[PDB]
Amino acid sequence: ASRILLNNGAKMPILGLGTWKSPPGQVTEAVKVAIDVGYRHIDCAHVYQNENEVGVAIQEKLREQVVKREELFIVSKLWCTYHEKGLVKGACQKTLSDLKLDYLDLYLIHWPTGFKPGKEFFPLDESGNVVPSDTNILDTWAAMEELVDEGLVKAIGISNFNHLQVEMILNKPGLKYKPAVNQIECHPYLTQEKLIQYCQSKGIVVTAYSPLGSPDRPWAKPEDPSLLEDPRIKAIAAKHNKTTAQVLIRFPMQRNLVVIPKSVTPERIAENFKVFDFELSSQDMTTLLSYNRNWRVCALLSDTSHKDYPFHEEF
Numbered sequence: 385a386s387r388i389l390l391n392n393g394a395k396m397p398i399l400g401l402g403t404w405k406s407p408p409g410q411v412t413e414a415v416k417v418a419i420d421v422g423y424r425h426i427d428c429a430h431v432y433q434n435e436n437e438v439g440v441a442i443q444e445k446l447r448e449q450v451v452k453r454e455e456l457f458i459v460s461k462l463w464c465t466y467h468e469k470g471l472v473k474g475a476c477q478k479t480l481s482d483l484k485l486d487y488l489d490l491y492l493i494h495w496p497t498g499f500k501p502g503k504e505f506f507p508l509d510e511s512g513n514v515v516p517s518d519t520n521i522l523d524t525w526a527a528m529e530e531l532v533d534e535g536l537v538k539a540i541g542i543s544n545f546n547h548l549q550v551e552m553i554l555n556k557p558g559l560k561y562k563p564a565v566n567q568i569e570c571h572p573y574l575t576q577e578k579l580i581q582y583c584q585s586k587g588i589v590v591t592a593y594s595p596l597g598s599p600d601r602p603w604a605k606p607e608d609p610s611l612l613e614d615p616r617i618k619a620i621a622a623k624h625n626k627t628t629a630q631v632l633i634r635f636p637m638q639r640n641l642v643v644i645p646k647s648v649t650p651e652r653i654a655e656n657f658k659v660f661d662f663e664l665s666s667q668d669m670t671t672l673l674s675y676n677r678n679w680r681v682c683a684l685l686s687d688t689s690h691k692d693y694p695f696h697e698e699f
């Protein structure tokens with residue numbers, strides 16, 4: 385199936401378009417092309433600084449009669465500097481205004497860590513440490529629940545939460561909505577078997593981000609492992625007459641994950657969608673899982689001391 389059922393009764397497309405590092409000058413066209421070739425899910429965030437341009441694309445294709453709103457599944461995320469309960473609605477409405485939408489299908493707490501409120505996305509002190517805010521996960525979650533109650537968003541979820549942090553929410557007395565989704569890094573070098581097992585056992589859908597290894601991440605080092613260039617994965621792709629990326633997107637699909645590869649290149653956007661016409665075998669799957677190195681492309685050492693930093697726990 386093309387979509388997976390969430391706890392709110394809504395269906396989420398298992399393939400979506402990522403937008404981190406899609407420049408505003410190019411993401412409008414990316415999203416238009418993606419909608420043309422069949423994408424219905426777009427992964428957004430305020431911190432990506434391109435939601436206006438994403439919203440221009442969606443507006444235009446609605447106006448062209450290519451899709452209607454109900455067919456789209458638009459996700460955004462509350463940034464770390466807005467975790468205070470008084471700031472959450474404002475942040476959500478800014479995102480809605482930028483995207484020119486009147487609801488989000490899914491709104492996530494982008495990271496469990498709250499940062500000092502202000503204009504800077506990464507507020508630092510004079511020695512480079514990220515400055516935290518005195519906010520906590522449960523209070524932030526209650527503020528997210530209010531967004532559902534007011535119809536701003538149809539579902540809420542989390543991102544980059546370890547299983548203890550997910551448990552905190554599940555075990556909150558008076559909880560009103562369980563998280564629908566946990567969006568985490570996931571690829572053959574970081575296969576997340578225990579966190580996926582946990583999440584799926586609790587009825588939480590998992591979305592895999594950076595499925596191609598985020599080669600464009602701004603802190604990459606030349607010597608870092610490179611998924612798209614891994615000759616072992618290229619070999620699996622050649623035997624299916626598919627590209628490495630296609631293999632890398634199909635892999636989490638077969639683990640009952642949602643997956644959100646990013647591109648601004650029209651040919652790659654189309655290429656990446658062409659993943660429902662082949663199957664990785666059992667051996668392929670076993671092989672790809674065996675490449676795990678517990679290697680993360682997305683972390684922040686300047687915030688390692690945060691009380692809620694998620695990656696000290698095993699999972």
Ligand SMILES: NC(=O)c1ccc[n+]([C@@H]2O[C@H](COP(=O)([O-])OP(=O)(O)OC[C@H]3O[C@@H](n4cnc5c(N)ncnc54)[C@H](OP(=O)(O)O)[C@@H]3O)[C@@H](O)[C@H]2O)c1
Pocket residue numbers: 401402403404405427428494543544567568592593594595596597598599600612627629630644645646647648649652653655656682
């Ligand atoms: N929740 C969070 O904390 C979080 C964190 C990271 C990412 N995410 C979401 O996950 C999405 C995907 O992750 P990501 O952006 O880190 O990286 P990714 O999707 O793993 O990889 C994106 C990179 O791969 C290139 N690429 C795309 N398709 C390709 C293909 N068929 N062949 C060769 N290269 C290809 C892209 O280049 P071009 O674009 O130049 O074509 C870009 O450089 C993000 O955009 C964001 O929406 C969420």
Ligand SMILES: O=C(O)COc1cc(Cl)ccc1C(=O)NCc1cccc([N+](=O)[O-])c1
Pocket residue numbers: 404429431432464495496497682683684687693694
């Ligand atoms: O967050 C994302 O979606 C992708 O990562 C981005 C994106 C942009 Cl626009 C800017 C900066 C980052 C980045 O340093 N993210 C890592 C990060 C941030 C905060 C906390 C953590 N943390 O580990 O607590 C990690």
